[PDB]
C-alpha cells in the first residue's frame, strides 16, 4: 500500500574523477569530469573552460578513460559503471546538435568473485590492444580491442595474487605487460605479467619481483623515453625498470598520504601529486642524454608547490593551469607559477567551484522570516569544512516602497542629455499620467512642460537631440529637455486612437488596429515613413537594434489577434516575411527579441499564462526550438534590463520568472516575489544599478540576486562540522566540529591552521573534574553561530579526548529555557568500545554560553532525542530516559534501561521510536506500566543503515550502505503476536547515493502529500513525497512507456539501474518513482512525446501539464 516519489533537488556537486584529452575533435583539448552518474564535457580554451555537453547515465561512473585505437579520428571514451555496465562511447557533432553514440557495450559482472578492496580498477594498454579490469579478488578480466566485439565479450585469467593494491600496464613493452603491487604476509611487492590474449595465460613478466614499502599504494607507468614504473608510498617514492632501482625518501612527504597524480609533460618528466591535506607537489625526473645512447633517469626530485583543496582529481590542462577535482571541498582552477609569490606559494587559485562536499548533517529553517524553506548544511571535512545555506529562487532586497494602486505601465527617465543617473519616473494609469522626480531617496510628483496627464501613456523613454518621447494613446508626441518644448506632434489621419506601441531610442512603430504607421525622430520632428494594414488586429509588437546598428531596428516581431500568430517583418517596408501560427485562440500578450551571445532569441507570451520560445537570425529567420513552457496563469509581460556581464529577459506575471542562459541554453528561476506586472531597469542617483517593479498597488526598487535556480551561501569553517541544531528563541545555530591538532615540543597539541573554533569571537573550555580514568589529536568543540551574520559567536572546547557525537536543542520537563544538549564519549589510546562519556547541558542566555548541568554516563552517547519531556539517549548499546529535575539535574532510574545500540534514532509526536541496533530497523513504543520501551515491531533482513525516517505512523523510510532506499510498513493482519512483530518492506529503490540525513521540510511554499529532504555524501539533495493510487500507477505507466522512447547513453536499462541491489539479493524497484525520469518527459521532441501517451483522458497537452505540477514540488 506504498506509493513514493523521488526527485533530485540538487545534482551531485562532488567530483569523483576527471580525465583530459582530445575527444571532441583531434584539434581540441577537453576536460572530462565525472560526477556519480554524470559526465561533464569541457573544451579547454584561452579564457578558461567552455562547456559543450552534459550527459546522464543509468549508473555510477567508476572508470573513465579516453583512448585512440589505431586508425581513429579522435579519442574514444571508456566508461565502466559501478553495477558492472561497460561501454565505449563516441562524440559525434554531426548535427548542429550533439551526440554521445555507443560504439560498443555489454555487462561485465561475474557470478563469481568478491569485490576487491581498493575497488574496481580499469586500465588500458598503450597499444590500445586491450582493456584490463580488476573487479574482484583472484580474477583479472580481459577485453580484446579489435574493431568488432561490439558487446565486449571478455575473458578472465586466474590471478594467483589474492590481494591487489594497484595496477597499470607498462609502456615500451613488446607485449601487453601488467605491473602491480600486491599484499601478502611478508608485506607488499611489485610484480609483472605478460598478457597472452592468444591463449589467455599470464606467462612470465619482463622483470622479476621486488619488495616495496609497507604502504606502497600508487603505481605510475612512465612513457617510452624512460619507461618503467614509479611507486609512491609513505615516506618513499621509487622508480623501477628492469634491474634499475631508484629511490627517494623526502621527509616533506612523510606526513599526509599521497592520494592522486597526473602527468604534466608527455615525456613524463613532471607529475603533479595530491595530499590528503591539500598539499600539491611536483615530481621531477631528471634526464641523461648519453653521447649517443637514448635518455635515462639519473634521479627523482619532489617540490612542494603549495596547497589546493583535498583533491580526488588533478588535471594539468595547459599553460600552467591545473583543474583540481575535489570531493571533500570546492573544486577549482589553479595556476601554477614559476616564481613563488607571497606566502612562498607557487600555486595561485584562479577559480573556485561550489561543492556541497559530503553533506554530513542538515536542517531546514525559515531563515529570513518568510514562509519559505531554506536549507543549512554541514559540508566538507577538515580544513574544507563549512556551512552552506541553500535558498530557492532568485530574490530582491527592497530600498523604497510607495503605494499607488492600479498602475498599468512604467518607463525610466534621465533628466539630462549626458548622465545615466535617471532622476524621473512616470506611471501610466487607466486614463491618466502623473510624473515624479528623484532628489536621491525622495519621490516628489509634478509634471513637465508638454506631458499629457489626462492621457494613458504606452511609452516614456528617450530619443535624440536632448529629447523625451511620449507615445500616449491620444498622439505620439515630442518634448525636448533644454528647449523644454513640444518640438512635434503626430496624430492619426482619422482621429482614431492608437493601440500597440514599439519604441527603441531612434525609431518608432505604432499600430492603430490592423493598421501600422512607421514614423521617425530625425532632427527635431516627426516623419511618416510607412503604412501597411495587417490581416487581423495587432496584439503586440517589438523593435530594438539587434547588433549591426545602434538605433535603427532592421526587423520586427508581431503578435496578431485572430489567427493567434507571431511574425517577422522588414521595417522600412513592413513586408510580410515569415509568420508562425500557434495553437489555440488566447491572445499573445507580449513579444520580445533580445541580443544574448550566440543564439539571437525571440519569444511570445500569451494570456492564459503560456509562453513559447524561438531563436532566429537577426539577418533572416529560421523557426527554432519549440517547447511550450508555462509560467503564471496571468498574461506574462516580457522585458529587458541590465545586470552583470550578460543581461536578461524578465517574465512579469503572477509567477515572476527570470530567463537566463544555461549551457548556452536559458535559465528558469522563480523570483521570490508576490507578483509583478510591469518591471523596468535602472541606474539612478538615488538607486544605481537596480530595477523597478509594480504589483497590485505597490511600487518597488532593488537589486537582483545571483543567477541560479538554487542560490548558495558559503561559510568557511576551516575545520570539520559534524552536527547542527537551530535554536529559534536564541536566533542562532549550534554546531559540533572537530579539528586536528598535532604533537609539539611540549608533547601537547598545537594546530595546523586557524579555524572556526580558534578564531571565535568568544570561547571557553571544559573544566569538569568528572574524570580520573609525532601523533594526531582531535579537539571537538561546540560552536554558536548567529543565524543572521553567521559569525562564530562562541566556541566551547570539550575535555581532552572527549568526542562529541550528538547534539539537540530543546526544553525539558517544566523548565521554560531551551538548552543545547550534547552527547559525548571519552576516547582513549586503544580501548575499542569506550566506557565513558557525558551528557552536557548548555545555556546560551543573553550573551554567553552557560554550562548548566553535566551527568556522567558509562559509554559513548551515539544519539539522543527529546521524547515527551525527558531526554532519551542511546549510550553504547543501552537506551535510557532522563529526567530534568526542578533543581536542574538530569537523572534516570538505572533499572529502566534497554538492550539497543541506536546508531540512528527518530520519534513520532506520539510514544513511538525508529531505532537501528544490529543492522536492523526497529519499532518501539513507551509502556508507562514498565517505565520502558516496548518492541512493537522489527525488520529482519540485514541492513547496514546510514540514515532513517518516520513518514507517518506506520511507514518508515531507510537508507543503506549499498545506495538503496527502502520503506518499511507494519502488518495489518491477525497473529498480532508474530506476523505483527515483522514490519515489511513495501518499497525498494536503488538511489545511487549515500544518504547521511533526512529531514521534514520543503524549499517550495510561499497534488501530493508530505515532503522529506535528504543530503548525500556527493552533495546531492533529494526529496521524497507520498502519492496516491492513481498517480503511482499513472506514473509507473509513464515510466515503462518512457524507457521505450528515451535514449540511454551506454545502452543501459533504467530498470537494471534503479533495481535494489545488495550482496544478498537483487529485486526490482517497488513503491517508488524517480521524478528525475518523469521530468524528462518535458525534455522530448513532440514526435516521441505522442508515442508515449498513446492513451482517464489521454493527451500530451493533458500530461505536459501533469509533470509541471511536480516540477513545482521543489
Amino acid at each position: 500500500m506504498s506509493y513514493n516519489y523521488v526527485v533530485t533537488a540538487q545534482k551531485p556537486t562532488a567530483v569523483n574523477g576527471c580525465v583530459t584529452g582530445h575527444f571532441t575533435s583531434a584539434e581540441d583539448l577537453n576536460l572530462l569530469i565525472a560526477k556519480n552518474t554524470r559526465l561533464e564535457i569541457y573544451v579547454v580554451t584561452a579564457e578558461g573552460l567552455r562547456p559543450v555537453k552534459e550527459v546522464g547515465m543509468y549508473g555510477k561512473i567508476a572508470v573513465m578513460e579516453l583512448f585512440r585505437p589505431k586508425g581513429e579520428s579522435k579519442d574514444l571514451l571508456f566508461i565502466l559503471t559501478a553495477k558492472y555496465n561497460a561501454c565505449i562511447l563516441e562524440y559525434k557533432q554531426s548535427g548542429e546538435s550533439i551526440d554521445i553514440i555507443t560504439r560498443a557495450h555489454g555487462n561485465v559482472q561475474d557470478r563469481i568473485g568478491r569485490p576487491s578492496e581498493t575497488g574496481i580498477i580499469g586500465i588500458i594498454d598503450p597499444e590500445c590492444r586491450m582493456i584490463g579490469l580488476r573487479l574482484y579478488d583472484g580474477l583479472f578480466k580481459v577485453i580484446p580491442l579489435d574493431r568488432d566485439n561490439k558487446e565486449l565479450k571478455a575473458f578472465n585469467i586466474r590471478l594467483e595474487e589474492l590481494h591487489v593494491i594497484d595496477v597499470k600496464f607498462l609502456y615500451g613493452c613488446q607485449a601487453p605487460t601488467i605491473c602491480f603491487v600486491y599484499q601478502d604476509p611478508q608485506g607488499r611487492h611489485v610484480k609483472t605479467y605478460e598478457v597472452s590474449l592468444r591463449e589467455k595465460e599470464f606467462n612470465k613478466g619482463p622483470w622479476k619481483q621486488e619488495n616495496v614499502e609497507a604502504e606502497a599504494s600508487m603505481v605510475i607507468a612512465v612513457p617510452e623515453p624512460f619507461g618503467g614504473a614509479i611507486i609512491i608510498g609513505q615516506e618513499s617514492i621509487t622508480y623501477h625498470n628492469g634491474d634499475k632501482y631508484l629511490a627517494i625518501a623526502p621527509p616533506i612527504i612523510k606526513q599526509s598520504t599521497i592520494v592522486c597524480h597526473n602527468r604534466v609533460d608527455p615525456n613524463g618528466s613532471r607529475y603533479l601529486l595530491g595530499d590528503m591535506e591539500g598539499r600539491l607537489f611536483m615530481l621531477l625526473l631528471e634526464k641523461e642524454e648519453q653521447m649517443d645512447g637514448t635518455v635515462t633517469l639519473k634521479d627523482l626530485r619532489v617540490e612542494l608547490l603549495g596547497e589546493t583543496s583535498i583533491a580526488e582529481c588533478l588535471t594539468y590542462l595547459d599553460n600552467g593551469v591545473v583543474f583540481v577535482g575535489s570531493r571533500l571541498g570546492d573544486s577549482q582552477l589553479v595556476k601554477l607559477n614559476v616564481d613563488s609569490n607571497e606566502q612562498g606559494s607557487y600555486v595561485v587559485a584562479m577559480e573556485t567551484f561550489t561543492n556541497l562536499g559530503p553533506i554530513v548533517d542538515m536542517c531546514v529553517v525559515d531563515l529570513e522570516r518568510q514562509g519559505q524553506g531554506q536549507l543549512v548544511t554541514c559540508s566538507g571535512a577538515f580544513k574544507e569544512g563549512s556551512l552552506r545555506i541553500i535558498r530557492n529562487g532568485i530574490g530582491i532586497h527592497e530600498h523604497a516602497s510607495i503605494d499607488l494602486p492600479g498602475i498599468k505601465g512604467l518607463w525610466p527617465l534621465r533628466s539630462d542629455p549626458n548622465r545615466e543617473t535617471y532622476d524621473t519616473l512616470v506611471l501610466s494609469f487607466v486614463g491618466q499620467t502623473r510624473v515624479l522626480m528623484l532628489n536621491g531617496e525622495e519621490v516628489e510628483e509634478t509634471e513637465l512642460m508638454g506631458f499629457v496627464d489626462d492621457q494613458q501613456t504606452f511609452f516614456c523613454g528617450n530619443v535624440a537631440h536632448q529629447q523625451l518621447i511620449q507615445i500616449t494613446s491620444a498622439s505620439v508626441r515630442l518634448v525636448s529637455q533644454e528647449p523644454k518644448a513640444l518640438v512635434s506632434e503626430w496624430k492619426e489621419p482619422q482621429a482614431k486612437n492608437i493601440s500597440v506601441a514599439s519604441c527603441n531610442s531612434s525609431q518608432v512603430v505604432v499600430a492603430v488596429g490592423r493598421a501600422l504607421y512607421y514614423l521617425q525622430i530625425h532632427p527635431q520632428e516627426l516623419r511618416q515613413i510607412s503604412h501597411t494594414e495587417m490581416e487581423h488586429e495587432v496584439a503586440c509588437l517589438d523593435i530594438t537594434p539587434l547588433g549591426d546598428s545602434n538605433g535603427l531596428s532592421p526587423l520586427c516581431a508581431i503578435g496578431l489577434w485572430t489567427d493567434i500568430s507571431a511574425r517577422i517583418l522588414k521595417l522600412p517596408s513592413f513586408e510580410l516575411l515569415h509568420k508562425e501560427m500557434l495553437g489555440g485562440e488566447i491572445i499573445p500578450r507580449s513579444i520580445l527579441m533580445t541580443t544574448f551571445e550566440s543564439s539571437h532569441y525571440l519569444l511570445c507570451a500569451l494570456g492564459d499564462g503560456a509562453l513559447f520560445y524561438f531563436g532566429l537570425n537577426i539577418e533572416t529567420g529560421l523557426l527554432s526550438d519549440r517547447k511550450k513552457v508555462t509560467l503564471g496563469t496571468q498574461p506574462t509581460v516580457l522585458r529587458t534590463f541590465r545586470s552583470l556581464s550578460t543581461t536578461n529577459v524578465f517574465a512579469c506575471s503572477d509567477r515572476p520568472t527570470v530567463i537566463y542562459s544555461s549551457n548556452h541554453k536559458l535559465v528558469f528561476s522563480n523570483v521570490n516575489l508576490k507578483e509583478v506586472n510591469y518591471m523596468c531597469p535602472l541606474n539612478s542617483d538615488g538607486y544605481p544599478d537596480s530595477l523597478a517593479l509594480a504589483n497590485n498597488s505597490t511600487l518597488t526598487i532593488g537589486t537582483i540576486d545571483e543567477i541560479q535556480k538554487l542560490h548558495i551561501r558559503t561559510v568557511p569553517l576551516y575545520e570539520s562540522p559534524r552536527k547542527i541544531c537551530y535554536q529559534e528563541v536564541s536566533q542562532c545555530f549550534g554546531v559540533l566540529s572537530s579539528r586536528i591538532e598535532v604533537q609539539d615540543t611540549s608533547g601537547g597539541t598545537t594546530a595546523l591552521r586557524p579555524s572556526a573554533s580558534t578564531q571565535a569571537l568568544s570561547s571557553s573550555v571544559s573544566s569538569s573534574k568528572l574524570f580520573s580514568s609525532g601523533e594526531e589529536v582531535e579537539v571537538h568543540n561546540l560552536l554558536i553561530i548567529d543565524q543572521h551574520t553567521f559569525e562564530v559567536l562562541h566556541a566551547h572546547q570539550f575535555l581532552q579526548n572527549e568526542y562529541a557525537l550528538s547534539l539537540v536543542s530543546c526544553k525539558l520537563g517544566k523548565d521554560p529555557n531551551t538548552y543545547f544538549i550534547v552527547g559525548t564519549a571519552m576516547v582513549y589510546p586503544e580501548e575499542a568500545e569506550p566506557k565513558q562519556g557525558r551528557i552536557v547541558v548548555f545555556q546560551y542566555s543573553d550573551g554567553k554560553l552557560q554550562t548548566v548541568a553535566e551527568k556522567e554516563v558509562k559509554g559513548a552517547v551515539y544519539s539522543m532525542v527529546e521524547f515527551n519531556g525527558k531526554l532519551l539517549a542511546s549510550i553504547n548499546s543501552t537506551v535510557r530516559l532522563y529526567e530534568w529535575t526542578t533543581e536542574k539535574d538530569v537523572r534516570t532510574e538505572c533499572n529502566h534501561y534497554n538492550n539497543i545500540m541506536a546508531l540512528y534514532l527518530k520519534t513520532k509526536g506520539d510514544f513511538i521510536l525508529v531505532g537501528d541496533l544490529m543492522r536492523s530497523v526497529l519499532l518501539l513504543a513507551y509502556k508507562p506500566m514498565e517505565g520502558n520501551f516496548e518492541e512493537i515491531a522489527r525488520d529482519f533482513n540485514p541492513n547496514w543503515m546510514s540514515a532513517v525516517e518516520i513518514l507517518d505512523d506506520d511507514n518508515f523510510l531507510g537508507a543503506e550502505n549499498a545506495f538503496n532506499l527502502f520503506v518499511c510498513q507494519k502488518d495489518s493482519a491477525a497473529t498480532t503476536d508474530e506476523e505483527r512483530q515483522h514490519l515489511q518492506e513495501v518499497g525498494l529503490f536503488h538511489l545511487g547515493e549515500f544518504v547521511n540525513v533526512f529531514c521534514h521540510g520543503s524549499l517550495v511554499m510561499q497534488p501530493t502529500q508530505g515532503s522529506v529532504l535528504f543530503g548525500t555524501v556527493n552533495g546531492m539533495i533529494g526529496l521524497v513525497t507520498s502519492l496516491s493510487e492513481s498517480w503511482y500507477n499513472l506514473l509507473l505507466d509513464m515510466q515503462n512507456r518512457l524507457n521505450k522512447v528515451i535514449k540511454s547513453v551506454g545502452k543501459i536499462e533504467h530498470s537494471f539501474w534503479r533495481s535494489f541491489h545488495t550482496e544478498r539479493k537483487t529485486e526490482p524497484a517497488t513503491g517508488f518513482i524517480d521524478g528525475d525520469l518523469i521530468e524528462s518527459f518535458l525534455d522530448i521532441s513532440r514526435p516521441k512525446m505522442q508515442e508515449v501517451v498513446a492513451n482517464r483522458e489521454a493527451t500530451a497537452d493533458d500530461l505536459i501539464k501533469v509533470v509541471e505540477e511536480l516540477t513545482r514540488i521543489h
Binding site: R327, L328, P358, R722, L805, V827, A832, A860, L903, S946
Partner: peptide
Amino acid sequence: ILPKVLHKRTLGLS
C-alpha cells in the same frame, strides 16, 4: 573504534 569509523563512513568511507 566505532565512532571514528562512523565519522569516516559519513565522509565517504575514508
